[PDB]
Ligand binder design. Structure first.
Ligand SMILES: Nc1ncnc2c1ncn2[C@@H]1O[C@H](COP(=O)(O)OP(=O)(O)NP(=O)(O)O)[C@@H](O)[C@H]1O
Ligand code: SF4
Length: 901
């Protein structure tokens, strides 16, 4: 307190625990030294914390000037910006590792670097250049010149470090023949402070406070600017906590100021944090005595039961205890499953490429129409099913039946000719969704960053997405089209190149990882997923170049020149700091969750000493979770004679205000049939001989598969293309099947010409059948429509398409199956005996199998048969259809709604 005064000098160090008044004491000394705007320099260490401390000072200060609030990287650029009295910075690592892919492919083509010849197949891989980039990016943070990395390649017998140092030296000579990376920005500025030797004295004479902040995360190359700027003038405060590694604080000759009172954390949270610091290689601080807090550890028995009790405890707190959303958080060790099972209880919770999302990709299809000049068929259907002018799949089927009234032509060709000029056919409501697509393609074709805005103006849906903000998808799409207008501007400053480049490119529960959870406050913190393979991280840190072994020989004597512990797993004592500092955010209470069928980590057995069987079916406060259970203890045979009264007493309070599922009108077991009528009632039923086999077999399959339920093929229309050719010279028919075959929906075009071969020969099999049996038979006609009245008084009235007559009359029915029906199974064949009974009365049978020509016969039992047609056709009358189990109870369409299974 006596060391922070306007009359004072030197370096003061300010260290304290997690939560204490550190960063709000640098703001308290920024203002107290002003009451000069300049020399009040901060180094906040984040781009978002720079504005958090700027607005804190400038509100506490009649207009004012600005204290200089910056970061370390943004300050080392301003030194380089002034030392050129412009120093440019290179792009993000796409353009910086696009240089790495060139120098490796430019080395494998040759035979100077000298890779150790085992790594020769590795050099073309994308996974080698994203590891070579890290051996340079982790020496750049530690100030190691490539002429000094090669000294390590000789003292130890490691050939791939001499090869890596010669890469990092040859890399820095084509980047200067400047161009600075991201991490190379502090190290390049520090060479320019000691170069001029008057640039120092014209910098130190400016600054007066140097309120550097968050000193613990500072690199040993960024820890030397703070030692250079604070060489001599005024007074400097360092601050931060020294025992959270994850200027220097631990070793200094400068006087320190400790802080032990927390101001945030409860005293029961402050004993679990400092209780874990006992088995850890200023660890004593106390909690806020005004608060009272709870720490508890819960276990689950599965993965889905974890997300069901997290969404329990997040729902108990807001809805009963009253703490709002956005004072809650869910911290996970690392993000790839939990946000889906936590939204399903009704909790507000706050990747995919840019040109792939449907609100953005529907507008890039307007540009491909515009760039070519004519719109195709496959990209004119893709505008109707998209967001611009939208149609559900049953209104494509209403366009086609209205456009084809203007063989039928294909829908891909009729659509384009309705956008080019609008026909006056439909005009009801489909005229509007076609005028919307003429308004876009006339605006963009009459006009590259000025056309793409003019398309967004014509397809007027910035108005429709603001009024409807289903209200989340408008805020997901508007937060995605504004990433086109940002990326499309970035290519214009440097329209077939627009499409070519983009193609390659509140009050909620914050779910975030541990490294993102070092800025929030959050009254309630859940640490989900502390278990065996996940939190004590046993993914081994080995690699090819030995990056994790270089980084702990070069940065300290953590390992000697022995590769024994170089590639094991993340260190456990340095992994305990993450769970010790994630609990350091909650100011009221902490819940720690892990599943155990997936085995809990040993950190869950250590918290249970300081906390205040696993669940397998947990309780929820979801409204669809109440009314499910309340209906299950009232519709019960066999417990709870007293609780049954309490069950139905609470459903009457749910049903009076809404809550769907509550009232006994809403229950799916309580609904009643619509009609239960006697069908036709009143009459002559009508039948065809191809349903009579089916009707007798099972009369429920007649009702559901003939009327509605029929799931759609390519094998049944070829079977009718054979019947058309056969009914019309055996070489004049092969030429007829050959032309028409090329338009059939066959994938695998090796199979279309392989299925033609068995259907070409099946016409030669038929003419090889005719000449054999034209001595015993004689054709009367072919494809006679049979119609008449049979079993007249109900009458059954057989109608339809006898295939081929012959005469010794007889009845020939041609089939194209491969496997024939047996000999004694065709004596009761219901199709032939309906034609045979047609031949007799008013106005033997053959069953020729073209394919694999084994024919079957039926002998010329009429009273036993004619009573069966009248007995079966009477069962197509009433309700309550019978579901017999037949041979066809497999590859039948209606089976998921059968009551016999
Ligand atoms: N004198 C005070 N009176 C009331 N509240 C205070 C006082 N001093 C600090 N606080 C509050 O205590 C909390 C501690 O925040 P602060 O001390 O600024 O964080 P920090 O410890 O510097 N940063 P970090 O450890 O990374 O979370 C904040 O909500 C402050 O507003
Ligand atoms: S599964 Fe059996 S009862 Fe059901 S429709 Fe098919 S044949 Fe008829």
């Amino acid at each position: 307190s006596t060391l922070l005064e306007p009359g004072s000098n030197g370096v003061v160090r300010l260290l304290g625990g997690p939560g204490t008044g550190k960063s709000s004491l640098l703001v308290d000394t920024a203002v107290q030294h002003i009451l000069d705007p300049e020399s009040v320099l901060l180094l906040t260490g984040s781009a978002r914390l720079r504005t958090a401390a700027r607005a804190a000072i400038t509100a506490r200060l009649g207009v004012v000037r600005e204290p200089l609030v910056r970061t370390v990287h943004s300050y080392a650029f301003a030194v380089l910006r002034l030392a050129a009295q412009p120093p440019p910075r290179l792009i993000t690592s796409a353009e910086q590792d696009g240089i790495i892919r060139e120098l490796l492919a430019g080395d494998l083509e040759d035979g100077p670097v000298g890779w150790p010849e085992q790594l020769w197949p590795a050099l073309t891989t994308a996974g080698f250049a994203t590891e070579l980039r890290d051996l340079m990016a982790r020496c750049t943070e530690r100030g190691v010149d490539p002429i000094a990395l090669q000294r390590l390649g000789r003292t130890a017998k490691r050939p791939e470090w001499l090869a890596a140092g010669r890469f990092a030296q040859a890399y820095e000579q084509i980047m200067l023949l400047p161009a600075l990376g991201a991490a190379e920005l502090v190290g390049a500025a520090l060479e320019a402070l000691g170069a001029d030797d008057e640039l120092l004295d014209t910098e130190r004479n400016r600054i007066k406070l140097l309120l550097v902040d968050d000193a613990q995360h500072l690199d040993p190359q960024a820890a030397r600017l703070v030692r250079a700027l604070a060489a001599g003038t005024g007074l400097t405060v360092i601050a931060g906590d020294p025992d959270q590694s994850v200027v220097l604080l631990r070793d200094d000759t400068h006087p320190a100021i400790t802080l032990t009172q927390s101001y945030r954390c409860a005293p029961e949270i402050a004993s679990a944090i400092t209780g874990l610091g006992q088995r850890l290689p200023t660890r004593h601080w106390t909690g806020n005595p005004q608060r009272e807090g709870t720490v508890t550890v819960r276990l689950a028995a599965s993965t889905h039961a974890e997300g069901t009790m997290i969404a329990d405890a997040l729902r108990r707190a807001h809805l009963v205890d009253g703490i709002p959303w956005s004072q809650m958080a869910v911290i996970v060790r690392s993000v790839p499953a939990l946000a889906r099972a936590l939204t399903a209880a009704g909790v507000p919770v706050q990747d995919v490429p840019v040109g792939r999302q449907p609100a953005a990709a529907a507008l890039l299809t307007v540009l491909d129409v515009t760039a070519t000049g004519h719109l195709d068929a496959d990209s004119a259907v893709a505008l109707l099913t998209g967001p611009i002018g939208r149609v559900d799949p049953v209104t494509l089927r209403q366009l086609r039946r209205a456009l084809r009234r203007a063989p039928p032509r294909d829908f891909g060709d009729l659509l384009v000719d309705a956008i080019e000029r609008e026909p006056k056919g439909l005009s009801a409501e489909h005229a509007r969704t076609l005028r919307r697509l003429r308004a876009v393609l006339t605006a963009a074709r009459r006009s590259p960053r000025y056309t793409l805005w003019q398309a967004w103006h014509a397809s007027g849906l910035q108005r429709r997405w603001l009024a409807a903000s289903v209200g989340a998808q408008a805020d997901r799409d508007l937060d995605a089209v504004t990433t086109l207008f940002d990326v499309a501007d970035q290519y214009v400053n440097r329209l077939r190149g627009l499409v070519d480049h983009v193609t390659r490119l509140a009050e909620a529960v914050a779910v975030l990882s541990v490294h993102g959870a070092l800025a929030g406050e959050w009254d309630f913190v859940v640490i989900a997923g502390v278990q065996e393979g996940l939190w004590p991280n046993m993914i081994p840190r080995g690699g090819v170049l030995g990056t994790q072994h270089l980084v702990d020989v070069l940065d300290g004597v953590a390992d000697m020149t022995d590769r024994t512990v170089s590639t094991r797993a993340p260190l456990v004592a340095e992994e305990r700091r993450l769970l010790m500092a994630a609990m350091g955010r909650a100011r009221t209470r902490v819940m720690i969750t892990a599943v155990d069928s997936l085995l809990p980590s040993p950190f869950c057995a250590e918290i249970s000493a300081w906390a205040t069987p696993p669940l397998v079916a947990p309780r929820v406060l979801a409204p669809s979770a109440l009314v499910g259970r309340l209906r299950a203890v009232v519709c019960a045979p066999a417990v709870d004679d007293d609780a049954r009264a309490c069950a139905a007493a609470q459903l009457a309070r749910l049903a009076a205000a809404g809550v769907p599922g509550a009232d006994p009108s809403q229950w799916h077991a309580m609904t009643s049939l619509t009609t239960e009528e006697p069908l036709w009632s009143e009459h002559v039923v009508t039948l065809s001989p191809s349903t009579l086999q089916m009707l007798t077999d099972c009369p429920l399959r007649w009702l559901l598969e003939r009327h509605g339920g029929d799931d759609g093929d390519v094998r049944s229309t070829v079977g009718s293309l054979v019947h058309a050719l056969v009914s019309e010279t055996e070489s004049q028919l092969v030429n007829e099947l050959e032309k028409v075959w090329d338009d059939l929906p066959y994938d695998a075009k090796w199979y279309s010409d392989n299925e033609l071969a068995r259907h070409r020969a099946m016409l030669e099999t038929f003419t090889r059948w005719r000449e054999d049996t034209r001595r015993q038979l004689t054709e009367v006609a072919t494809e006679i429509p049979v119609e008449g009245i049979v079993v007249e008084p109900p009458g059954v009235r057989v109608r339809g398409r006898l295939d081929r007559l012959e005469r010794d009359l007889v009845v020939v029915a041609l089939k194209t199956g491969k496997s024939p029906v047996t000999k004694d199974d065709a004596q009761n064949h219901a199709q032939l005996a309906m034609y045979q009974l047609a031949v007799a009365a008013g106005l033997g049978g053959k069953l020729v199998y073209l394919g694999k020509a084994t024919e079957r016969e039926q002998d010329p039992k009429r009273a036993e048969w004619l009573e069966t047609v009248g007995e079966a056709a009477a069962a197509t009358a009433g309700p309550r259809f019978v579901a017999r189990v037949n041979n066809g109870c497999a590859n039948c369409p209606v089976r998921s709604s059968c009551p016999a299974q």
